[PDB]
Amino acid sequence: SFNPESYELDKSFRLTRFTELKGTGCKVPQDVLQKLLESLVMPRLGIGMDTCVIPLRHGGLSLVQTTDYIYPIVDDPYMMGRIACANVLSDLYAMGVTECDNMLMLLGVSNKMTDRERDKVMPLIIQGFKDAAEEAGTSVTGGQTVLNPWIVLGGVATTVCQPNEFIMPDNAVPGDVLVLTKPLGTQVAVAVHQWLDIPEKWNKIKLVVTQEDVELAYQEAMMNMARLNRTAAGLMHTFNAHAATDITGFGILGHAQNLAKQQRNEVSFVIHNLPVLAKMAAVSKACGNMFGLMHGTCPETSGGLLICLPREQAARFCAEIKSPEGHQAWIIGIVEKGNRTARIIDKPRIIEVAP
Amino acid sequence: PESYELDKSFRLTRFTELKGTGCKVPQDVLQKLLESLMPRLGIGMDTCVIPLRHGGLSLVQTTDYIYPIVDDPYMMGRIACANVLSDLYAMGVTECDNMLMLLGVSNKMTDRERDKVMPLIIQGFKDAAEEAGTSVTGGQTVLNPWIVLGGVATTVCQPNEFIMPDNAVPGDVLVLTKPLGTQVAVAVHQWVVTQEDVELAYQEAMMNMARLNRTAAGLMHTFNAHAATDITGFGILGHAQNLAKQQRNEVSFVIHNLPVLAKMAAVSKACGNMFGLMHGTCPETSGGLLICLPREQAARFCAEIKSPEGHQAWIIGIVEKGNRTARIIDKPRIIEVAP
Numbered sequence A: 001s002f003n004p005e006s007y008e009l010d011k012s013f014r015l016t017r018f019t020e021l022k023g024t025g026c027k028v029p030q031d032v033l034q035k036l037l038e039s040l041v042m043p044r045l046g047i048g049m050d051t052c053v054i055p056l057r058h059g060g061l062s063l064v065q066t067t068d069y070i071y072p073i074v075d076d077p078y079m080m081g082r083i084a085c086a087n088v089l090s091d092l093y094a095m096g097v098t099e100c101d102n103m104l105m106l107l108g109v110s111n112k113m114t115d116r117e118r119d120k121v122m123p124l125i126i127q128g129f130k131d132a133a134e135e136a137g138t139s140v141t142g143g144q145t146v147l148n149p150w151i152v153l154g155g156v157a158t159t160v161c162q163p164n165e166f167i168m169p170d171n172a173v174p175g176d177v178l179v180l181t182k183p184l185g186t187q188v189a190v191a192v193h194q195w196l197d198i199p200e201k202w203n204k205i206k207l208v209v210t211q212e213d214v215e216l217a218y219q220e221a222m223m224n225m226a227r228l229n230r231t232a233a234g235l236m237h238t239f240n241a242h243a244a245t246d247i248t249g250f251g252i253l254g255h256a257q258n259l260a261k262q263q264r265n266e267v268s269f270v271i272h273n274l275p276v277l278a279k280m281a282a283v284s285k286a287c288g289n290m291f292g293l294m295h296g297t298c299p300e301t302s303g304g305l306l307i308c309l310p311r312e313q314a315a316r317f318c319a320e321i322k323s324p325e326g327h328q329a330w331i332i333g334i335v336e337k338g339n340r341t342a343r344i345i346d347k348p349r350i351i352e353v354a355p
Numbered sequence B: 001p002e003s004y005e006l007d008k009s010f011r012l013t014r015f016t017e018l019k020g021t022g023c024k025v026p027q028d029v030l031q032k033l034l035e036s037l038m039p040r041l042g043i044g045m046d047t048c049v050i051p052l053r054h055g056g057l058s059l060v061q062t063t064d065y066i067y068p069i070v071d072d073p074y075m076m077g078r079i080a081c082a083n084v085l086s087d088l089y090a091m092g093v094t095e096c097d098n099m100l101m102l103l104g105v106s107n108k109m110t111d112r113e114r115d116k117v118m119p120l121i122i123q124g125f126k127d128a129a130e131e132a133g134t135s136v137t138g139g140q141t142v143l144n145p146w147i148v149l150g151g152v153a154t155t156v157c158q159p160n161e162f163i164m165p166d167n168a169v170p171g172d173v174l175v176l177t178k179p180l181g182t183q184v185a186v187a188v189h190q191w192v193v194t195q196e197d198v199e200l201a202y203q204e205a206m207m208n209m210a211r212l213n214r215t216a217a218g219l220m221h222t223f224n225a226h227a228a229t230d231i232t233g234f235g236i237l238g239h240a241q242n243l244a245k246q247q248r249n250e251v252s253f254v255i256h257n258l259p260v261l262a263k264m265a266a267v268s269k270a271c272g273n274m275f276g277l278m279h280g281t282c283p284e285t286s287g288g289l290l291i292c293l294p295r296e297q298a299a300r301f302c303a304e305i306k307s308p309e310g311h312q313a314w315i316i317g318i319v320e321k322g323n324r325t326a327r328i329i330d331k332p333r334i335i336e337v338a339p
């Protein structure tokens, strides 16, 4: 429902033009990252998870905060704004923190975009960011906006919590299960949407999926990426979640491993199946080692929460989230006595997910 | 550079594009873009000030990012950090509860350069933070066409810790705690003036940009400051006009003299309208505080900040009755601040 025409722009405008897409995404890779950052009674959390937790000098309060930024991934500016904001907030929600006391916005304007575009397109993005922040029960009260070759979209989310408002991501025990609350394959969906404007590329998977399927995985990806994990965070309290992370840029497996290493208990995770936006596995599979959606290594953007739940609270949680109005969740695996690592079995079961 | 198995021709500042007018979206555009969006401070100053439910406390925070501006990776990380904290300091907040770091690793730089250079930048950032009694406990690191350098500063404040920047009155004076001209030093050192004139100026500016505004923040309390901002990407007039518009009273700011890095005024004059330094709209990086001070206190503040680690500050203008605007006088005196 975005038409460049409907705004006095060239029919040819793509918001996705102001960055370069990569099957494996834009984040400095996990292992490279962990090396570059080597010098850097109340539970604290420093570098390594989704949020810091910084005990404050005042009254048993802790500072809980997070930052993130991405580049344009859909051509709908308003929705892209929602997504940039939802991605920022995703990480509070990984800590079960339902409230956001304040947001900041990180904005890059493309030095390649005309004034007309900027004054037309940027406001949609800002409205989108503001509206998601409003659903989140918070607001943007400062930020930074500079010229960059690419459109940069991010922000900061900070909460000053009492001890029970957050859940430390380390209480998993053998016999917990793994609940994922959004389907995988967002990167395939957005990229493959960009490929249809490009013959050479569209010729390749032309033989795998219809333009209709692609439009459909796109609207769906866009929908779920704009979806706040706020509800999922709240339900983690009710159903006694032991640990959670969210699935963003390092892919289902990278973040699963990252959660696994934080566990106090000697446990490991095994992922047995993967919910995936329909047709996207076949697409990833059709493009060799470009995405790797099958191996857990493909980037997600603003994915869902991966949650360690008591075996007996798992189904109640799924029930509740799906039928409050809500969106179905999936139990994808198990936690075991293990060495603090994560794996997807060799031949995982693909749960094809339809709109 | 050759010291780290890197090209004799490796330049950190190669990984951005220099514009005499800097990279920030103009003040005037940003307002149009953004017009869709216990004391309380929202958009429009140096920090936000968000009253919380707990203990009469307020969440005071700020975020910023820049690109390479000096060719010393370590000092650039130092400057990157000093720059984010500067906004806590404008508010008179000497303490930082937490920092996050923003990093963009240029796709144009080799894995080898990335692997040598980034740990250096990060190291300067870490040291700057520690100097400010804080540390970095999170961030985001992403590929970009340029090297991107920022972060966030956060403090959870009792009311006593900050000074609302809106309390100026006629007769107050304006003091500036770091000299001007950084964009010019930085612009020409990548390239009337000698190379020794330009090298020493670049060396001064680099140290000035890495200096914290923390001792000034503290001294704002000691000497009962009435308002403050810090002089950064919009330059001297730009930030003075944004501070003036913030005033509760009917006051305007008049700036009479400009303390500029030695010879940088001379470089600005020659480059036509490339910098526009004496006009007030030349971008600074991690500049000093501009403080509205009772006339009686201003002298002591300046003497005190000169020697408590000691650094010179200037009384550059006056607070007068008016309609909440700022201007540079028609023929401003340029104070030449030598190394």
Ligand SMILES: Nc1ncnc2c1ncn2[C@@H]1O[C@H](COP(=O)(O)CP(=O)(O)O)[C@@H](O)[C@H]1O
Pocket (backbone or CB within 6 Å): A104, A105, A106, A107, A140, A141, A142, A143, A144, A145, B034, B037, B042, B043, B044, B045, B046, B047, B063, B064, B087, B232, B233, B234
């Ligand atoms: N994308 C954005 N969203 C919300 N607020 C913003 C954004 N960009 C800038 N701001 C706010 O607008 C004002 C002007 O920005 P800057 O000039 O960068 C403030 P400073 O010079 O103190 O760093 C500040 O209040 C800043 O926090």
Ligand SMILES: Nc1ncnc2c1ncn2[C@@H]1O[C@H](COP(=O)(O)CP(=O)(O)O)[C@@H](O)[C@H]1O
Pocket (backbone or CB within 6 Å): A037, A040, A046, A047, A048, A049, A050, A051, A068, A091, A248, A249, A250, B100, B101, B102, B103, B136, B137, B138, B139, B140, B141
């Ligand atoms: N430049 C940086 N400085 C300090 N910490 C960083 C930096 N970049 C990333 N981090 C931290 O390193 C960890 C991994 O990074 P990310 O995967 O981006 C965290 P998430 O996936 O939850 O967004 C996080 O705890 C993050 O806060």
Ligand SMILES: [K+]
Pocket (backbone or CB within 6 Å): A049, A050, A051, A066, A067, A068, A091
């Ligand atoms: K994060």
Ligand SMILES: [K+]
Pocket (backbone or CB within 6 Å): A142, A143, B045, B046, B047, B062, B063, B064, B087
């Ligand atoms: K700021």
Ligand SMILES: [Mg+2]
Pocket (backbone or CB within 6 Å): A049, A050, A090, A091, A094, A245, A246, A247, A248
């Ligand atoms: Mg996360």
Ligand SMILES: [Mg+2]
Pocket (backbone or CB within 6 Å): A067, A068, A069, B139, B140, B141
């Ligand atoms: Mg991140």
Ligand SMILES: [Mg+2]
Pocket (backbone or CB within 6 Å): A067, A068, A087, A090, A091, A248
């Ligand atoms: Mg994240």
Ligand SMILES: [Mg+2]
Pocket (backbone or CB within 6 Å): B045, B046, B086, B087, B090, B229, B230, B231, B232
């Ligand atoms: Mg400022």
Ligand SMILES: [Mg+2]
Pocket (backbone or CB within 6 Å): A143, A144, A145, B063, B064, B065
């Ligand atoms: Mg700024």
Ligand SMILES: [Mg+2]
Pocket (backbone or CB within 6 Å): B063, B064, B083, B086, B087, B232
């Ligand atoms: Mg600033």
